Design a protein around this motif. Structure first.
Motif, mmCIF file in Angstrom:
data_model
loop_
_atom_site.group_PDB
_atom_site.id
_atom_site.type_symbol
_atom_site.label_atom_id
_atom_site.label_comp_id
_atom_site.label_asym_id
_atom_site.label_seq_id
_atom_site.Cartn_x
_atom_site.Cartn_y
_atom_site.Cartn_z
ATOM 1 N N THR A 30 -4.205 15.187 -19.527
ATOM 2 C CA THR A 30 -3.106 15.214 -18.568
ATOM 3 C C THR A 30 -3.477 14.493 -17.277
ATOM 4 O O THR A 30 -2.631 13.832 -16.663
ATOM 5 C CB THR A 30 -2.696 16.657 -18.276
ATOM 6 N N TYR A 31 -4.731 14.612 -16.848
ATOM 7 C CA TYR A 31 -5.171 13.972 -15.618
ATOM 8 C C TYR A 31 -5.149 12.454 -15.756
ATOM 9 O O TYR A 31 -5.425 11.896 -16.821
ATOM 10 C CB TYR A 31 -6.580 14.437 -15.247
ATOM 11 N N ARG A 32 -4.814 11.784 -14.656
ATOM 12 C CA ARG A 32 -4.793 10.328 -14.592
ATOM 13 C C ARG A 32 -6.074 9.849 -13.921
ATOM 14 O O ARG A 32 -6.387 10.270 -12.802
ATOM 15 C CB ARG A 32 -3.564 9.835 -13.827
ATOM 16 N N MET A 33 -6.807 8.972 -14.600
ATOM 17 C CA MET A 33 -8.099 8.497 -14.127
ATOM 18 C C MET A 33 -7.968 7.078 -13.590
ATOM 19 O O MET A 33 -7.406 6.204 -14.259
ATOM 20 C CB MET A 33 -9.139 8.543 -15.248
ATOM 21 N N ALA A 34 -8.492 6.854 -12.387
ATOM 22 C CA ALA A 34 -8.475 5.540 -11.763
ATOM 23 C C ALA A 34 -9.822 5.286 -11.103
ATOM 24 O O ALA A 34 -10.552 6.218 -10.754
ATOM 25 C CB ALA A 34 -7.344 5.414 -10.734
ATOM 26 N N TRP A 35 -10.144 4.008 -10.932
ATOM 27 C CA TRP A 35 -11.402 3.584 -10.336
ATOM 28 C C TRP A 35 -11.131 2.923 -8.993
ATOM 29 O O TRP A 35 -10.251 2.061 -8.884
ATOM 30 C CB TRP A 35 -12.151 2.622 -11.261
ATOM 31 N N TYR A 99 -0.299 15.620 -10.695
ATOM 32 C CA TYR A 99 1.050 15.349 -10.217
ATOM 33 C C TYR A 99 0.988 14.288 -9.129
ATOM 34 O O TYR A 99 0.211 14.414 -8.176
ATOM 35 C CB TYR A 99 1.714 16.620 -9.682
ATOM 36 N N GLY A 100 1.806 13.244 -9.270
ATOM 37 C CA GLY A 100 1.816 12.165 -8.306
ATOM 38 C C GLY A 100 3.162 11.474 -8.269
ATOM 39 O O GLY A 100 4.027 11.696 -9.120
ATOM 40 N N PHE B 441 3.139 15.330 -14.297
ATOM 41 C CA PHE B 441 4.159 14.472 -13.696
ATOM 42 C C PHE B 441 3.489 13.175 -13.251
ATOM 43 O O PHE B 441 2.779 13.150 -12.240
ATOM 44 C CB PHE B 441 4.848 15.170 -12.527
ATOM 45 N N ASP B 442 3.718 12.100 -14.004
ATOM 46 C CA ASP B 442 3.169 10.776 -13.702
ATOM 47 C C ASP B 442 4.321 9.777 -13.767
ATOM 48 O O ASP B 442 4.572 9.173 -14.812
ATOM 49 C CB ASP B 442 2.045 10.414 -14.669
ATOM 50 N N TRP B 443 5.018 9.603 -12.642
ATOM 51 C CA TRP B 443 6.144 8.679 -12.600
ATOM 52 C C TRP B 443 5.705 7.222 -12.665
ATOM 53 O O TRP B 443 6.535 6.351 -12.946
ATOM 54 C CB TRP B 443 6.973 8.915 -11.336
#
Ligand SMILES: CCCCCCCCCCCCCCCCCC(=O)OC[C@H](COP(=O)(O)OCCN)OC(=O)CCCCCCCCCCCCCCCCC
Ligand SMILES: CC(C)CCC[C@@H](C)[C@H]1CC[C@H]2[C@@H]3CC=C4C[C@@H](OC(=O)CCC(=O)O)CC[C@]4(C)[C@H]3CC[C@]12C
Ligand SMILES: [Mn+2]
Lengths: 123, 493, 117
Positions: A30-35, A99-100, B441-443
């Motif tokens: 679920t988490y979004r990973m960015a560098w 959430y973003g 929630f990733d828009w």
């Protein structure tokens, strides 16, 4: 979520390096990973990132320059260093977001950070 | 993988529906061409009306008697009314019959099915007196045999018409179900269209639309090749020779698990199909019958129908073998039913296990699109805008037929709805697991926002359809014209 | 179902008279209406009838049968009347509850209208 950065080193120009951001928790897909990279001269800037659905995002001159991939087997995200040049010497950080909003380049969008790793290249 | 499966599912469903539509249209054109050559005041074939039922509503029974009496035909041999029960409370409908017709109840001593002399003349003396039947309660199947014997004694009778006690007949309903069998000697059985008069309940209206779609699509496709299944029932005709020669096998058969009062019709249709005679269906004849308004009763009825179909599928394949170059379509459809059920179960299990938002949104959108196409076709064929409410039939179908089919397969302190509750608990747990796992929630992601937009649009469409249906009930627009006079007469008692 | 009819009057060889028989109730689309030439006091005979659903029966061609099928009444017209032909009519009705066969017998008929010339 806890983010641990490991990797980096000192190599010649055009070398290949691998950087991985270890993470763990109840849920990781679920988490979004960015560098994010950080240089002493300037502030942090977005270079690459991956969403929950394995979507690839790149900055200017990063579309074919670098590749980003993630796997759920060990719950880590790894990025490949291709064609390293001295102007790319910066401290690399990894961020996790649940959430973003619509934007992702903004530094304050991500509510989590990590210790980071040092990557230095001279020639 | 999942996208390929969804695509092949959609294309197969669309192709089969298009082929069935083409077959139904061809059958309708052939029937119209046959009708165009019909001479005026055609009364070549005699009609012997047989009515059977149990626990019929007094108002419904009176309306059915008026409807059959209002039927216009050149010549009718007699009307036969058979009543399953002979108890003191069962005399109400017999007295109602005495208000519409002559007082000829003539209570038989014992049911004729197990009687040593299987002749209708034992309990009947005059053929023109429209004798009534009051037999002991021993099953609805036994009631039809007495009426068949009563109709079979008259050499002047060439065909019979089977109507339920609750069904409502039209003026030309009798002629439309007896004309097609006379023109072609091969054709011997004709099936009439059945409709539901009351549609106030959401379940009732969906059931009515499903019945209309089935009669106008599957029955037409079967009648194009002249392999109609379940020809009998309300508004059904049978030629005297076939029924006379197959009455004994239809009544002498035994079953392991039999309901107290069910009545077998698929067995009769299969027995007719054994002889190889062709059966055609016509939509011109219109019959009106009631439908259950309770979810539990509808589930029980669907379970019983599924059990009967599973029991009779063994003998269904044998009938297709007898026909030369015919019945292959019937066998293919019979295999297609179980293949479709298994494939949809596998798809549901796969989408539940994977819990992928992209696949679930795609498959629900495909299902909504195909249901919308089917509803549009139904509206175009029926020339009515009320057919657009068929989209909500998917929910009740998924929540009722699947547990009913599972219970029917398992069967072959009620302990009848336990499987239904287990299925509901399982689907609820699957939904909870799917929603809990995908909680973010990733828009920024294009795929996630696309799935969210699609699911929101689907929910909005469902809510809008529900709202327009709800306001239609208050406006009373969705009420069928026939049921308005029925309730008006019931109020004016 | 009560039936009442009006008409009659002077009779002429070349004259034509029209008779209408009105009834209250429902025909049920299965009841046959028949007329009778003379009163049943001494002699009565059948002249014409026709089922409500359709068809017709005569005795001819001098008698025309018309059904409105809207206000549950029917009209009968005759041409080239004879002195012996003119008499009282009843426009009786027969119920189909007993049997559907064409009895043709006035005894079987139950609903009898008022006799008017
Ligand atoms: C008639 C009915 C009509 C219904 C629609 C009506 C219009 C409303 C349209 C939008 C509906 C809700 C969609 C999500 C909106 C999220 C808005 C938002 O910002 O929510 C905040 C909340 C987290 O807030 P927080 O973390 O405190 O702050 C975030 C910013 N810093 O964010 C959250 O918690 C977001 C959580 C969203 C989760 C949505 C579900 C995703 C997965 C769905 C799978 C469904 C599968 C169903 C089974 C299918 C099987 C075939
Ligand atoms: C946390 C709780 C309260 C939410 C539970 C969600 C699910 C139980 C619901 C939401 C929408 C429903 C779906 C909407 C549409 C369809 C298509 C249907 O297949 C057909 O279209 C058959 C067509 C035919 O031949 O009639 C199978 C069931 C299904 C997936 C439904 C299954 C049950 C669903 C997933
Ligand atoms: Mn009923």
């Amino acid at each position: 979520v806890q983010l641990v950065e490991s990797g980096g080193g000192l190599v010649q120009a055009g070398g290949s390096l691998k950087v991985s951001c270890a993470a763990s928790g109840r849920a990781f897909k679920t988490y979004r990973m960015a560098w994010f990279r950080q240089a002493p001269g300037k502030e942090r800037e977005f270079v690459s990132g991956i969403s929950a659905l394995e979507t690839t995002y790149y900055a200017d001159s990063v579309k074919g320059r670098f590749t980003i991939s993630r796997d759920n087997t060990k719950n880590t995200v790894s990025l490949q260093m291709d064609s390293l040049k001295p102007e790319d010497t910066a401290v690399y950080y990894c961020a996790a977001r649940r959430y973003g909003g619509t934007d992702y380049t903004t530094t304050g969008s991500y509510d989590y950070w990590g210790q980071g790793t040092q990557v230095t290249v001279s020639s | 993988s999942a996208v390929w499966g969804i695509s092949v599912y959609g294309v197969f469903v669309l192709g089969f529906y298009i082929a069935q539509i083409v077959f139904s249209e061809f059958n309708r054109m052939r029937l119209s061409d046959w009708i165009s050559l019909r001479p005026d005041n055609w009364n070549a074939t005699r009609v012997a009306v047989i009515i059977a039922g149990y626990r019929e509503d007094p108002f419904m029974f009176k309306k059915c008697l008026e409807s059959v009496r209002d039927s216009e035909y050149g010549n009718v041999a007699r009307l036969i009314c058979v009543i399953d029960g002979d108890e003191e409370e069962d005399l109400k409908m017999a007295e109602i019959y005495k208000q519409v017709y002559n007082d000829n109840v003539k209570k038989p001593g014992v049911v004729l099915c197990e009687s040593e002399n299987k002749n209708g003349s034992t309990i009947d003396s005059d053929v023109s007196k429209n004798i009534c039947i009051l037999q002991p309660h021993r099953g609805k199947r036994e009631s039809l045999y007495t009426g068949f014997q009563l109709a079979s004694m008259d050499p002047s009778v060439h065909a019979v018409v089977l109507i339920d006690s609750d069904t409502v007949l039209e003026k030309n309903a009798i002629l439309e179900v007896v004309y097609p069998l006379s023109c072609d000697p091969n054709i011997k059985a004709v099936a009439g269209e059945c409709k539901i008069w009351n549609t106030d309940t959401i379940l009732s209206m969906l059931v009515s639309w499903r019945y209309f779609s089935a009669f106008n699509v599957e029955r037409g496709a079967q009648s194009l090749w002249k392999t109609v299944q379940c020809v009998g029932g309300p508004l059904g005709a049978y030629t005297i020779d076939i029924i006379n020669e197959i009455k004994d096998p239809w009544i002498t058969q035994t079953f392991l698990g039999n309901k107290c009062t069910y009545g077998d019709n698929r067995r009769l249709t299969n027995e007719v199909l054994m002889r190889g005679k062709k059966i055609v269906y016509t939509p011109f004849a219109v019959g009106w019958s009631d439908s259950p308004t309770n979810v539990m009763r509808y589930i029980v009825q669907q379970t019983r129908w599924s059990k009967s179909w599973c029991r009779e599928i063994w003998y269904t394949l044998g009938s297709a073998w007898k026909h030369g170059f015919s019945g292959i379509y019937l066998a293919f459809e019979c295999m297609y039913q179980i293949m479709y059920f298994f494939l949809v179960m596998y798809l549901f299990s796969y989408i539940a296990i994977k819990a992928d938002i992209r696949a679930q949104t795609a498959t629900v959108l495909v299902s909504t699109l195909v249901t919308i196409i089917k509803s549009s076709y139904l509206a175009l064929r029926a020339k009515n805008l009320k057919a657009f409410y068929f989209v909500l039939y998917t929910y009740v179908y998924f929540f009722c037929m699947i547990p009913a089919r599972i219970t029917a397969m398992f069967t072959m302190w009620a302990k009848q709805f336990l499987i239904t509750y287990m299925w509901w608990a399982g689907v609820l747990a699957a939904g909870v697991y799917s929603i809990v796992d995908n909680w973010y929630f990733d828009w920024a992601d294009i795929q996630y926002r696309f799935a969210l937009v699609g699911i929101c649009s689907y929910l909005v469409f469902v809510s809008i359809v529900l709202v327009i249906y709800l306001i239609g009930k208050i406006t009373t627009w969705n009420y069928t014209p026939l049921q308005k006079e029925l309730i008006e007469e019931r109020y004016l008692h | 179902v009560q039936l009442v009819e009006s008409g009659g009057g002077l009779v002429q060889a070349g004259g034509s008279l029209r008779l209408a028989c009105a009834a209250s109730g429902r025909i049920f689309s299965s009841d046959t209406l028949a007329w009778f030439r003379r009163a049943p006091g001494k002699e009565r005979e059948f002249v014409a009838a026709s089922r409500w659903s359709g068809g017709g029966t005569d005795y001819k061609g001098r008698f025309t049968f018309s059904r409105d099928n809207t206000r549950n009444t029917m009209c009968l017209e005759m041409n080239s009347l004879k002195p012996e032909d003119t008499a009282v009519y009843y426009c009786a009705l027969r119920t189909a509850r007993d049997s559907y066969y064409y009895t043709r017998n006035p005894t079987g008929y139950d609903y009898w209208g008022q006799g008017t010339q």
